[PDB]
Amino acid sequence: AGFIEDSKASLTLRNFYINTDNRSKQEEWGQGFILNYQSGFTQGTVGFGVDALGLLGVRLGTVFPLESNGEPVHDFASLGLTAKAKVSNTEFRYGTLQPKLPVVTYNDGRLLPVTFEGGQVTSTDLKDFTLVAGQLEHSKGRNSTDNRSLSIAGANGSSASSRDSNKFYYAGGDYKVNKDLTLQYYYGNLDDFYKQHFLGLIHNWQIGPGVLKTDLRAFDSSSDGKNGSRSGRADGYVSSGYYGSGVTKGEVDNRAFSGLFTYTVSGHSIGAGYQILNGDSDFPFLNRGDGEGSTAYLITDVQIGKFQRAGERTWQVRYGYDFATVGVPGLTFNTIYLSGDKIKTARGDQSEWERDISLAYVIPDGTFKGLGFTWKNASFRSGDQDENRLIVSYTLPLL
């Protein structure tokens, strides 16, 4: 064990094509290079290390940043360094972070991923728990090279009226009860905007040759600091939502609850889910806007929409098939249909729906083993947008 001996790299090559049809036709195509380096740890009870994440995108408004012109740049790149220390199974990371947690997860829906900057400790030293606590200050969008302060929908974007915050605190854990059951509690706090608590359960139930997976989530989001005061909201510390009389910005105030059940047998997966949002505000999550990408940890966060609006109840059905069971390993199909209603708006109750498909083939063997091809299509109608993604990806070891 050591800094050198345990050092690893990695290069992912991503060819990313997207076309969107609005009712605008828009098309973007890029080649991406994602180079990760991860050192080992120096010797001693407290070991030190450093990770590096190099990102490069080359053009072949959500994929590439713009020139002072207004035209898409030819290329863009960034380097994100992370200092690290570790004792036993407890690691501290300082610098570039990419969390995937119920109260914060980075978006990677385009060419290059979102990154955050901050400090974080994670630990598996407490038996059957995976614990984490951290503080984030900035994020770099998928279509940007710059770190910017954190915001939420309603206060975000780049207008003069926009407001943001440079402090986000988070903590929580996953407790493994046994082989079949995991519990979760997480806490998130964007300073001057919101505090958010999350409870989760995932249960796997063997029923004959099939497995039923139960996925339950509960979020309580409330105001913090400026957003919780009249004067603060007057100065723009606000969330999108619906507050009566045509007012669409105000205090964070959202309760979200969902249950998703997926039964999987003989290659087939069939799922059904329901999500209920109550309160005057949309569901809050870190979101810079300006096309930078954002992810909500909701069962309804899909290709185009997130069904995250104040009041919205959403049902969904899912179907998938893994063609390995039938002789074509590496080929999979998935689809989901979602239907949202009771969206509170100045026009009364509104509805929306989305249908997504994802067809993917990853070459299972031979010289091109690991080469993956993915087609994602979405249709979204609200109050309308159709989107296609084509992604070719390949990851290779560079030790």
| Distance from C-alpha of 63 to C-alpha of 55, rounded to nearest angstrom | 13
Distance between CA atoms of residues 28 and 62, nearest Å: 8
| Cβ(301)–Cβ(295) below 8 Å | yes
Residues 279/254, Cβ–Cβ less than 8 Å: yes
Nearest to 27 by CA among 70, 57, 59, 75: 59
Nearest to 303 by CA among 217, 375, 241: 375
**Stretch (H or E) spanning 389:** strand 385-396
Resolution in A: 1.9
End-to-end CA distance of the chain: 15
Determine the Cα angle at 67 with ends 66 and 69, to 5°.
115
List of domains in the chain = 6-399 (2.40.160.10)
Cα–Cα distance, 362 to 330 (Å, whole number): 5
- The neighbouring-strand residues paired with 195 are 189, 222
| Sign for the pseudo-dihedral over CA of 121, 125, 126, 128 | positive
Can you tell me the distance from the alpha carbon of 35 to that of 13, in angstroms, rounded to the nearest whole number? 9
Q: Is 338 exposed, middle or buried (0-12, 13-18, 19+ CB in 10 A)?
A: buried
Strand-strand pairing, 350-362 and 372-382: antiparallel
CA dihedral 195→158→52→46, nearest 10 degrees, is: -30
The token pair at 349 is 């109750």
